[PDB]
Amino acid sequence: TKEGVLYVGSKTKEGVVHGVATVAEKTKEQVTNVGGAVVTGVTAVAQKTVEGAGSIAAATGFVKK
Amino acid sequence: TKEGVLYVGSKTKEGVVHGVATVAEKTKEQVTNVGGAVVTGVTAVAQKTVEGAGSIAAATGFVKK
């Protein structure tokens, strides 16, 4: 009934990858928030599947009071 | 009934990738918020599928009071 194919094929000679960098000097509040996965690579694949009537996905930095 | 194909093919000699960079000096509140995945690569693929009548996806930086 439901079918799916994902095909990734890659060739490279040289690859340099810098993923997620968070840097702070003298700061008070700094937030990095990722609701999914973090994937970093010469070849990078992220696949997510959710099956269900009432799926809730929520992602927020910060809540005060 | 439902079919789907995704095919990614790539070749490169040189690749340099800088993904997500968040930098702050002397700041009070700084927020980086990603509701999906973060994917960074010489070849990068991100796939998300949601099946359901009442899917909620919510992403907000910050809430005060």
Added chain:
Amino acid sequence: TKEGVLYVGSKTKEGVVHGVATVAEKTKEQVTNVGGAVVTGVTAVAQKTVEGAGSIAAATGFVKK
């Protein structure tokens, strides 16, 4: 009934990619908010599918009081 193909083919000799950069000096509130995925690459593909009668997608920076 429903069929779909996405085909991406790429070749490059040299690639330099800078994805998402957020920088702040002496600031009070700075927000970067992405409701989907963030994908950055020499080849980059982001695919999202939602199936359901009442799908809500909401993305806002910040809410006060």
Added chain:
Amino acid sequence: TKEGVLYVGSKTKEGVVHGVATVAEKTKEQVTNVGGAVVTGVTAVAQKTVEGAGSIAAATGFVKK
């Protein structure tokens, strides 16, 4: 019934890409808000499909009181 094809083919010798940059000095409130995905690449593809009678998509910077 519903069929769809997306085909992307690209060749380049040199590519330099700067994606999304948000910079602030001495500012109070600065917001960058993206309701979809952010995709930045030598080849970049973003595809989104929503199937359902009451799909809501909402994107606003900030709400006060």
Added chain:
Amino acid sequence: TKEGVLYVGSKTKEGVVHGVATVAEKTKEQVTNVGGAVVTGVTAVAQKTVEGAGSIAAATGFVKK
């Protein structure tokens, strides 16, 4: 009924990858929060499947009061 294939093939000569880096000097509160997995490799794949009517996924930096 439901079938799915993910195929990733890669060849490279040289790869250098820097994954997630969080750096802070003299800062008060700094948060790095990932709701999914963190996967970093010359070839990197992250796959997550959720089956069930009421799946809740929540990811937030910090909550005060």
Added chain:
Amino acid sequence: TKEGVLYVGSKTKEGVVHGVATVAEKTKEQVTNVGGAVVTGVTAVAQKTVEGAGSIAAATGFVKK
């Protein structure tokens, strides 16, 4: 017989100074040539004295054949 006074007094709260910057992309011949000193500062003073009947000072970018 010969007397001389130089007096420099300075007060500032904030200072940012970028001195001498030379940048080149894909260029063949680029020259930056300074016959005196290079002095760059929040307070910067350069004093030169030459005493003698036949003083020669010469400054030229480049000579070919």
Added chain:
Amino acid sequence: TKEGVLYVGSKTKEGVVHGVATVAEKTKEQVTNVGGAVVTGVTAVAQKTVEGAGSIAAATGFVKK
């Protein structure tokens, strides 16, 4: 007979100084040549004295054939 005074007095709260920067991509010949001293500081002073009948000072980028 000959008397000389140089007096430098300075007070600052914050100072950031970038002195001499030379940058080149894919260039063939780039030259930075300073005949005096290079002095870069929050307070910077450069003083040179030459006493003598035949003082020669010469500064040139490059000479070919």
Added chain:
Amino acid sequence: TKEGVLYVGSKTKEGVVHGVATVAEKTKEQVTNVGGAVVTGVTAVAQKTVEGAGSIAAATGFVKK
């Protein structure tokens, strides 16, 4: 007969100094040449004195053939 005084007095709360930076990617010939001293400091002083009838000072980047 000949008298000379140099007096430097400084107070600062914060100082950040970047002196001499030379950067090159894929370049053939790049030269940084300083005939005097290089001095870089929160307080920086460079003093040079030459006494003599035939003082020669010469500073050139490069000579070919």
Added chain:
Amino acid sequence: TKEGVLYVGSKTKEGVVHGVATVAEKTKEQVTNVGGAVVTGVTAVAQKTVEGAGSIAAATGFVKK
């Protein structure tokens, strides 16, 4: 007959100093050449005195053939 005074007095709370940085990727010939001293410090002083009729000071990057 000849008298000379150099007086340097300094006070600071915080100081960060980056002196001489030379960086190269894939370059063929890169030269950094300093004819004087290199002095880098929160307080930095360089003094040179030469006494003599025929003082020669010569500083050049490179000579070919």
Added chain:
Amino acid sequence: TKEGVLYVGSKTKEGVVHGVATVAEKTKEQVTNVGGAVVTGVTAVAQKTVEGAGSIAAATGFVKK
């Protein structure tokens, strides 16, 4: 007959100093050449005196053929 005084006085709470850094990846010929002393310190002083009719000082990166 000839008198000379150098007085340096310094007080600091915090100091961080990076002196001379030379970095190279995949480069062929890279040269760092200092004709004087290299002095790096929270307080740094370099003094050189030469007395004599025929003083020669020569500083060059490299000579070919």
